[PDB]
Design a protein around this ligand. Structure first.
Ligand SMILES: Cc1cc2nc3c(=O)[nH]c(=O)nc-3n(C[C@H](O)[C@H](O)[C@H](O)COP(=O)(O)OP(=O)(O)OC[C@H]3O[C@@H](n4cnc5c(N)ncnc54)[C@H](O)[C@@H]3O)c2cc1C
Ligand SMILES: Cc1c(C(=O)O)nnn1-c1ccccc1
Length: 337
């Protein structure tokens, strides 16, 4: 299991936080997962599952057995003409899996290109970008129940997907996702509702655009605008876009005409969290080794040497400010440990 004791978790989380783990193992299959669980239980330790550590905020030393999911495997399950069921192990890296799918001529994942992390973590966070969510293509997953060790399958309804949310993120220590099945397509019409994606695609003058073509535009836009943790530690968008009811939206828009929002089918309004934080004065904020990115106001950053506690406290500060100022509470996207 390539076990290490008292090992630093710095290279395993995109914020670059330097806490240390009491044990660190690497699981390459389901037997390893079972061995790691028994080992944690035999030794009186909790078990902390990690993938690419790109949605984790570590705030203290980890008195647990940290299990890095590193199982490999990607395959086509059934090809049903336009629809195609594909399957990947939890440890498979997400963006190489998107590229694997497009190289097979399958559409569906192109708008989720270049998101960090693993296939296993993607349903838990219901990852989303440029108008697409994982739940749009989700068929099923296999998860180990950590209350009794049994395996069960979840279809889409049983996953209780929501905005950057799922049953698994609500009960975080309960299920351990082993493999994920998605339904991809061929020859479908192509999701270009986002202005800048459509504009840059059109500028390229492809006679007949495809999913691969969309994927290369999204990669270029993401590389252009989103800080890379390689250089500046972060977990992407720290906050979710909040939803408010129609009355709250009336008082806010009647007080701020410039309010950026996305109307929903049920009459509620999803506010742009980045606009709230910018309009609150936080963009470019910096206090000691932590701050808010100068152009992407949603992105909290580790300039170097931050503890996880300092990141946590800046976020709580931004939260309190935006609550006090516009009466809106910003929820975080990252998971806190
Ligand atoms: C630069 C950057 C850009 C990003 N852009 C986006 C974006 O556009 N859209 C978006 O939605 N997200 C985005 N994210 C965050 C996104 O959630 C992660 O990139 C990714 O989904 C997390 O996967 P991971 O494997 O890194 O999970 P980790 O951070 O390792 O884990 C996160 C949580 O999920 C759990 N988890 C991981 N694997 C398993 C498993 N097999 N079983 C059970 N629990 C598990 C962990 O226990 C932890 O609670 C971004 C992050 C970064 C750093
Ligand atoms: C573009 C984007 C989306 C989206 O397009 O919905 N979600 N997060 N995110 C993001 C934002 C800042 C940093 C990293 C990722």
């Amino acid at each position: 299991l390539e076990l290490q004791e008292h090992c630093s978790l710095k290279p395993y989380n995109t914020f670059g936080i330097d806490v240390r783990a009491r044990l660190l193992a690497h699981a390459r299959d389901e037997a390893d997962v079972r061995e790691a669980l028994a080992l944690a239980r035999e030794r009186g330790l909790p078990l902390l599952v990690i993938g690419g550590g790109s949605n984790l905020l570590l705030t203290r030393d980890v008195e647990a057995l940290v299990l890095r999911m590193a199982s490999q495997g990607r395959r086509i399950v059934s090809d049903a003409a336009d629809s195609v069921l594909v399957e990947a192990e939890a440890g498979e890296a997400w963006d190489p899996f998107v590229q694997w799918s497009l190289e097979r001529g399958l559409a569906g994942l192109e708008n989720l290109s270049l998101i960090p992390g693993t296939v296993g973590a993607a349903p838990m966070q219901n990852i989303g970008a440029y108008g697409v969510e994982l739940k749009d293509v989700f068929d099923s997953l296999t998860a180990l129940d950590r209350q009794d060790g049994t395996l069960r399958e979840f279809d889409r309804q049983a996953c209780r997907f929501g905005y950057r949310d799922s049953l698994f993120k609500q009960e975080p220590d309960r299920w351990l996702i082993l493999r994920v099945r998605l339904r991809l397509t061929r020859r479908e019409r192509l999701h270009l509702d986002y202005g800048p994606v459509r504009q840059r695609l059109e500028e390229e003058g492809i006679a007949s655009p495809t999913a691969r073509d969309v994927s290369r535009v999204i990669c270029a836009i993401r590389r252009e605008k989103l800080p890379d943790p390689a250089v500046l530690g972060n977990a992407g968008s720290f906050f979710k876009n909040p939803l408010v009811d129609a009355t709250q939206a009336e008082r806010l828009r009647q007080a701020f005409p410039d309010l950026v929002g996305y109307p929903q089918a049920d009459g509620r309004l999803k506010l742009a969290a980045g606009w709230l934080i910018d309009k609150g004065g936080w963009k470019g904020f910096r206090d000691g080794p932590v701050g808010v990115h100068a152009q992407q106001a949603l992105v909290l950053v580790n300039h170097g040497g931050a503890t996880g506690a300092q990141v946590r406290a800046l976020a709580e500060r931004i939260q309190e400010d935006v609550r006090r100022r516009f009466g809106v509470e910003l929820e975080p996207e990252p998971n806190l440990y």
